[model samples]
Target: ASSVNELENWSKWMQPIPDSIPLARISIPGTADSGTFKLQNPIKQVWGMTQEYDFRYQMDHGARIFDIRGRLTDDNTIVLHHGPLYLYVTLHEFINEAKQFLKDNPSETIIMSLKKEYEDMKGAEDSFSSTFEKKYFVDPIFLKTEGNIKLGDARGKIVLLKRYSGSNEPGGYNNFYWPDNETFTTTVNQNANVTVQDKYKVSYDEKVKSIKDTMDETMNNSEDLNHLYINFTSLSSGGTAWNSPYYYASYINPEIANYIKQKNPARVGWVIQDYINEKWSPLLYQEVIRANKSLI
Candidate 1:
């Protein structure tokens, strides 16, 4: 915890991103259930790998994108959740903390993937909009455009990557639900430059190679240069059993890290992995940062 917090701030962790690529090209390691770790029940747990180090820790570790899922608690608070499990932290709580982080680190930008979780979320859309605008947003701090958002426009602001419909809050970009045929290769949202489709049927041991091959074939051959490829490096073992995300990640992430290190730097886009290990002399996230910046 102290080691990550002790490093350089978010924007300068590697260096200023070039203006040629949008901020979306800055390779991001997002938490799958960023709010899942704190729950006490076994059923609520998504996987063993936890992005549970609080907003400050995630920001300190240079994570620019946060996948936040929420459900309302009994006390009328919009608490973060993974599936049916209600987390201890509130959505407002994290937003408040994120605001502080942005204040402390001005050059950075954040992409908040807001999604509604669980059933009976009748009024979550309206409630989330009200709460988000009242608390997390402020002028010059929030990016409220419907068109393309460039790297320069995102400084010191939070970009809303809304996963839910019927929102009246400040708009940014539209996100596609999932990719066609479970393979992501083209633009899903015509209004935005980001696209994502998750695949997770491969055997646990073979998932690493499978993921690497898909990423290489799709990312390397992408037609849109400015597009954000959300290369999802997370998985489940065919829904048979909940394999330890930490266990699978140890094998999967290393292959991805090595592949990024060897391949062209520019092809590495937004990667949301299960477990993130910085072992083995070479830092994984740093390589991601290097790839984004040094890409041709």
Candidate 2:
């Protein structure tokens, strides 16, 4: 994965396939459905999956991102399943939304909403236990309140999680509780063309999920498309990774990891795809790195 700064030095090289490398990848953009998309190791008939990604924040740095995955587009202007997409969130929107959610719903809290939404979307298959963690207020003290005890009975209800607003910068976000019919939108706070990087490993099971697709399919759609925002794991730091950048992991605290691990659509901040490259072509590439590196 090359840095934004490496573009210049990589430009000359990006133009020609260096004969030094044995193999490389030529990406076919818009092929992947859910972030993890790349062709690797078909030579040895190797079959492996990657949870890693080559991410980019700014195509040039001081640029504004209008749409989320728009930046991941290549020089040819096509997005892919495995790509270089950079998404950021600040502190302003994070707090604003969280505060608004709580203020909007009185009888139903955010925590309750998340669990309800999860179960409704996938159905009883991945239903969570009636048990729930307490919701807390972050201002003065760690003053808190536990979730509704009668969760098992709260079927067909709304869930608005009191969780952190998953983000990378100062602001944060919370997931939609009853996502079966909810929607979220992330305004990058800028008007720059937002590049939607469409390369999250479109599984062998072919599918296309985007703002338009969801609305079109009407398969558990949400009005807020931006709710499922993208925060690149390009940076390494600390926080509840589920609520921050995925790479901001030191060690998965048993509790935090477990909470989101069981999600149906591969929980937020969890890198569930793998990619390897053997060669680099004019701003394009072909994979040579074997996916099965550890077992052998």
Candidate 3:
């Protein structure tokens, strides 16, 4: 198949895959800080920005999962944030974009990993969890089913990967304990187990090794359907310029993409990375979507 042709059809790449397959088993492309693309200032750009485009662009490029960090405002609405910095994007904006994409391509499902990035504003009317449940989660676009979600059931819906503590709703993937900056294994629901490689503040070598190791385990494991592996290829360090996420992504994106191209592994877990664009040599998202050809 022509690379250009495949790239164009990425928005509906999930259409060919069998619906009987559980979503956990698919090799999915994701963004690390999905909403930070709007940062323009140099300092915030280096530290906060991970994507170079908007949510619609990311979705068109075949990013199935989103790492959404939100802050509860005094207005009781959730806005996207990267730690203390507001991302200039809103939670509703992301949902609307995803909903539109799914409507255009009903064969696809979006897995949104929602986390509370900053503390709620002091004068907020309600708690963060309550406000989100009342305002956003009430929509039918968010799939209300629980446990290991299947592609058949998830099409045209948003699957929530809850990262907040107090969720009154019982749908999507349930929240589990995630230790900071380490590879950890925990259960998301009673039937599903997740292994995550999220060593963000480490050296580049260590971060790459952790990504490969977690991916290797995912590839070799026999229980592929019930196990979820989230591998973050994005890394950052304490520097204003050279050690920024953009700098690392320039190297890591091609490195992992070449790795996948060479290995041609059937599974690559849910790859969440930085600077997702067409500039890379061996495009990470393309290679990830290609890996799913084995499923077809």
Candidate 4:
């Protein structure tokens, strides 16, 4: 398929599609403010402003992975925010949107990268997970805790790409556990797999290079399989990509896109970015999906 629009469902673009290909192979995890809707004005046309597009729009376009960040309010409610600036919607609202999307499109799966942000409240982890389980994920069966997740197995499910702890929930679940920070290599079902990257370095070039290096390492390794890779292709300070979100995009996205285009598709993993460019993101998703096709 040339465009996600051509697919019967979003997941259909998964390169000959899937019976059980790990989500890491064909998922597009979006960075912070992925669900942020409503903006006051355009004081700056930077990524910070651009990042606040509607989630429904993103899902329609093909964003299966959500990099969700929020803080536990004094009232113990989970509010989605970027640093001190509170976003337009709550975590609850986003979850409702997610469920509705699943209802409408049962073949696709969603991977939520849940991370706690700002004001470290006591028991925040437990509180966040509690709210997740009680409010949004009221149906725990929807939570896929297995390490190696498959799209066919998790169809229409909300797989947890966990980045935090303290959730009183026990083990043996489908949660893709991630350590605190900067994990280049991790064991996914006994295979050394590359996972999520959130390092928003201050140096612009450094940030770009690190992301590329991670991708290159993964593609070149050629031995590891059954693991996932996530690239946070933008910087973050207050929930949104820092400064002009597209600034980093200009530096990094092209190389990333071209890299994926050149490499073996199966190695291209979950790539997360700040905002979607109508001109480029669609094509990028196409390349990402092509990588998942084994017959090619």
Candidate 5:
């Protein structure tokens, strides 16, 4: 019954969860291409856009994880990007927004998955890893403690899930080998194992099956605290208006939300989705957060 209260206070839902629980064991809602909401051009919107809302909105709606893709600019700063297209949002902007959210709700923590989306700009001074660490990650809001982090260690902090290599700093989850357009299992560190369903370019039927298959494994093995399961519900297609990520998300979001509603699984893993909004019936983030009642 108290789970309903969590849905109401979605932004601070972590307040009720115990600090001892490993972050990996909790059901987390995340955005796939989290910074693409600003694309206004039809062509860019069709091919690049994934989220319709901004980062603050996403965090308020129970999205604790962010898939941040960035490019190293010539001035030694990082800007968000989707392939070669600039998202008009910088990596520092995203971090500032997350810092504000964490400050407002000190009980919550954010898992930021950082990736180098495009090649470095001409005349770039330093490597992607060096630029980010020197300029941005020096902030105290970023958690530096590594390994299978627990809720107690992560509160009011941004936990880095490093997708770029050659890190000189220690903290957050380390980067691992992620095969393109397929589901695979790999170890992030000695303490944690990850199973990822990230088949982005596939038939709709095949994509749905992959999501369900990974979710099934997560639900059954919810007791495994050290294993992390990441299921991406976002899919891409040929660059056409009719076959855009938004088009697929329109159908896939509700389908998966309804499936979770029916099954009411104990764990939903880390669900990284596209086009996250309340327009869909049985909102995906709501159901994913509700699954955490078992943890509380």
Candidate 6:
């Protein structure tokens, strides 16, 4: 408590975004019995892996799930609250708009460069709940510790990561009520119904409409100043998950700058995830860093 209040509150949330990438802020509600968190409105300047609200910790005694009620800048970076949220977003031509905001407010401290990573989420990838899922992703801590005698504590650092293992394999993985099918390399996938308020990246836009319409559809609260009624679905592969390089930098910070192109790339073309209880995760990617919003 003392550390949080005394720290400089060095904000990396607004920095890592691409100069052109846009961001936003919004809030939700907490589902936990305690009802502690929400995306629609969020608890700001606290300690947690992500302000996304949907995220739960391994230590969650079912007491940690918050309903994404925080806020963020245009870059999709997260800030937790308890009510409606603020979102930073854009699928087409967001950079120019963001740059304009910067030029308009020279003293604005949020965005100055493209190196900001969410402060609390920087090293979350290394923290995994090996006791439960036995997640197979590479734990950076294992390498960082490298048999060190006594360095920094790593026990409290593991963060659970999500992956889209494409498949219709189990028909909803143990009745998890999972949504959407994985986007297969050879099949068409749609990534719609995902919001971009406090969180970042990954949406569902047909691109059929002009950027204006698209924004109006997904973002742009022309009427509802406190709500985000838009989403994005990709052409290649799509589903509902907290994965996207566009909002959080696939390499490090927010992935809002990038986008979901329909054509497909060689290394990262398309993938598909099947509802649970089925087979086929052809749409899943290995794993991306989320939560534990970074500070670097």
Q: lDDT winner among the candidates?
A: 5
Q: Pick the candidate with the highest TM-score.
A: 5
**Candidate 4 on 1-296: residue-level lDDT in tens?**
23434343443343345455555555354545575455554533342444646777677666777767787776667777655556666877777878788777676767776777656466554466676556655565365355656566777677765555655553222344565445455654444365667676456667777777777765654334465677777664332444466566654666677777776545656677765656554356555555554422
- Cα RMSD (angstroms) for every candidate in the order listed: 4.8, 21.7, 2.2, 4.3, 1.4, 22.4
lDDT of 3 by residue, 117-164 (tens): 999999999999999999999999999999888999999999999999
- Please write out the lDDT profile of model 5 over residues 1-296, one tens digit for every residue: 24447645878988888899999998999999899999988988889989889999999998999999999998889999999999999998899899899989998999999999999998999999999999999889999998899999999999999999889999899999998999999999878999999999899999999999999999999999999999999998875858999889999999999989999899989999998898988888889998998876
Range of the 10 consecutive residues with the lowest summed lDDT in candidate 3: 1-10
Clashes of 3: 0
Compared with the true structure, model 6 gives a TM-score of 0.19
Off by over 4 Å in 2: 1-8, 11-186, 193-274, 279-296
Which tens-of-lDDT digit does each residue in 97-201 have in candidate 2?
Answer: 334433432221111111111112222231122122211123311113222212222111222223222322221123223222223333332221111222322
Clashes of each: 0, 61, 0, 8, 0, 122
Please, what are the lDDT tens digits per residue for candidate 1 over residues 1-296? 12333233444452355445566555666656666556555544444235545667666767777778776544445677766556777777777777788888766777888876655365544465555555454445568875557766776778778776646665566645554326554443444555564665456645665566656654564444556677666674422154655555656667677878787555566777654444434445555665554433
- Per-residue error at 75 for model 5, in Å? 1.0
Candidate 6, 129-206: lDDT as tens digits: 221122221323221221111112222122111222322221111111223422111111121122222212223332
Clashing pairs in 3: none
Error of 3 at 110 (Å): 0.5
Q: How many pairs of residues collide in model 6?
A: 122
Of candidates 2 and 1, the better by TM-score: 1
- Model 4 residue 172 lDDT? 21
- Identify the superior model by TM-score, candidate 3 or candidate 4: 3
Error of 5 at 173 (Å): 0.3
